[PDB]
């Protein structure tokens, strides 16, 4: 039923400012401050799993930024994506100068993309004979345990498996099914998510790949701990031969091409590009 | 109950000979011909899944050989591993000159290693606090479908998922559990194999890795088709935090460090080295 908004911002600093950790935080502030799109405040605060927001890392030139001072007026890029009602579009700032605790910046909207989720399925249909390339252009954090049998999840709820620096196709499409579900309002999925993921990496073929684990700062604590974490970057190209599972997976992946993948996407992690090639 | 034999051969050609496809075939001939270890004939012919043999590819210097002429008397290496009764040890050739349809070669035994499977568990115990590095030194072929839900295996028995050029830890330990099972005589495992594999990659952490897909010839047909295939080479290092699943997996991996991994190991594919490091 609802729709997705993908807003492309050009950010420019107004002095020499030292970027915080990670970059995305600067705009996060502006949302919690309500200086830009106050409506989203609630949806930022929401600790609900698989929430539909994405405040990307700040991108210089072509690539994002991960663990250091920035020139006076360098041309930066960013992307915020989310989903509520078209009403919010009445109050998005379009232009402006905002101060933060970091500094002051000139925000100018470069692009706007709005689409309905059901309109995506149409796009899903024309790729049922293309190979699927998923490209992480941001540090992506995928837990392995989301693929643990739902039942048994109590027993092993003691030990932390961390983040699969080497992710299976099933894990990613499970996550995309999670965000797709929490989007269209579909409670209790983890069993279906599970079963679908197992089903997926069980009968899907990796065509080619380049991945590599990455260590990134996700922000200092209050008490002083500079939190670091392990994730995975690079691209992975594969295919699924079963028509059903393909159509479903494409329909979830398209969603992730906006809202991102895994967690925590509320801070720029999991940003992906989705590419296609023929046979 | 039984035990494993790992025989290290030094092979030398007696003229200039053109190696066949793959290399391992040359010794395979000698087993079917019974020229070397006739007893193994039966166990070569056996198309039983997860049979306990391994006729490695011929290794020049340090590394195996995959898709071309060889000098008169170059010093080659090979390893044949398997499991039957100590009786066979009475008739292993030790030394000799054998002719083939390929040519004639001088075989000299360089090393002998015999161990009992229960003796392995002792070795398993002293690593419960080491990281596990699995190194494929041969093209390894792992099907993804071995991780499909046993029940549902009928429905999707139509489409071929091929070989996971990107393997999950679960897939490999599932395979090792398969060979370990068919070894000690333990019928009907695929459900336990399944459940164990899912359980494994669900709560295991990849520490580091380097993998890359490889295309290798597995032999021309009769009708003339030079069969090629996709597999995976490189190393992958990981760990499992649950004590139980670790002890089990180590106990299966040790077995695979002899009998090899996946299929088809009857021709040198799946040869691995198992390494350990502290924390």
Curated annotation (Swiss-Prot), chains A, B:
Family per similarity comment: Belongs to the CRISPR-associated endoribonuclease Cas6 family.
One BP annotation, GO: defense response to virus
Gene Ontology MF terms: endonuclease activity; RNA binding
Keywords (A to Z) from UniProt: Antiviral defense, Endonuclease, Hydrolase, Magnesium, Nuclease, RNA-binding
Tree of life domain: Archaea
EC numbers: 3.1.-.-
Name recorded for this polypeptide: CRISPR-associated endoribonuclease Cas6 2
UniProt subunit comment: Possibly part of the aCascade ribonucleoprotein complex.
Keyword RNA-binding listed: yes
Cofactor(s) recorded in Swiss-Prot or TrEMBL: Mg(2+)
Keyword Hydrolase belongs to the record: yes
Matches recorded under InterPro entries: Cas6_N_arch, CRISPR-assoc_Cas6_C, CRISPR-assoc_prot_Cas6
Species whose genome carries this gene: Saccharolobus solfataricus (strain ATCC 35092 / DSM 1617 / JCM 11322 / P2) (Sulfolobus solfataricus)
Biological role stated in the UniProt entry: CRISPR (clustered regularly interspaced short palindromic repeat) is an adaptive immune system that provides protection against mobile genetic elements (viruses, transposable elements and conjugative plasmids). CRISPR clusters contain sequences complementary to antecedent mobile elements and target invading nucleic acids. CRISPR clusters are transcribed and processed into CRISPR RNA (crRNA). Functions as a ssRNA-specific endoribonuclease, generating an 8 base-long tag known as the 5' handle.
């Amino acid at each position: 039923m609802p729709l997705i908004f993908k807003i492309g911002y050009n950010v420019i600093p107004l002095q020499d400012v030292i970027l915080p950790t990670p970059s995305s935080k600067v705009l996060k502030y502006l949302i919690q401050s309500g200086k830009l799109i106050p409506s989203l405040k609630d949806l930022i605060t929401s600790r609900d799993k698989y929430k539909p927001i994405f405040i990307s890392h700040l991108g210089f030139n072509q690539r994002r930024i991960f663990q250091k001072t920035i020139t006076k007026g360098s041309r930066l890029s960013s992307i915020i994506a989310f989903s509520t009602q078209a009403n919010v579009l009445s109050e998005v700032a379009d232009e402006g100068i905002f101060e933060t605790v970091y500094g002051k910046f000139h925000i100018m909207i470069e692009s706007i993309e709005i689409v309905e989720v059901e309109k995506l399925k149409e796009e899903v249909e024309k790729h049922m004979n293309d190979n699927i390339r998923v490209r992480f252009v941001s540090p992506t954090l995928l837990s392995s345990k989301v693929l643990l049998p739902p039942s048994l999840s109590e027993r092993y709820k003691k030990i932390h498996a961390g983040y699969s620096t080497l992710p299976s196709v099933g894990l990613i499409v499970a996550y995309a099914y999670n965000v797709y579900c929490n989007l269209i309002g579909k409670k209790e999925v983890e069993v279906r998510a599970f079963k679908f993921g197992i089903l997926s990496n069980a009968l899907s073929r990796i065509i080619g790949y380049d991945l590599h684990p990455v260590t990134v700062a996700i922000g200092e604590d209050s008490k002083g701990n500079l939190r670091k974490a392990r994730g995975v970057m690079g691209w992975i190209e594969f295919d699924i031969p079963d028509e059903r599972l393909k159509r479903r997976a494409l329909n979830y992946l398209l969603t992730s091409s906006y809202l991102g993948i895994g967690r925590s996407r509320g801070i720029g992690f999991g940003e992906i590009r989705l590419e296609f090639r023929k046979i």
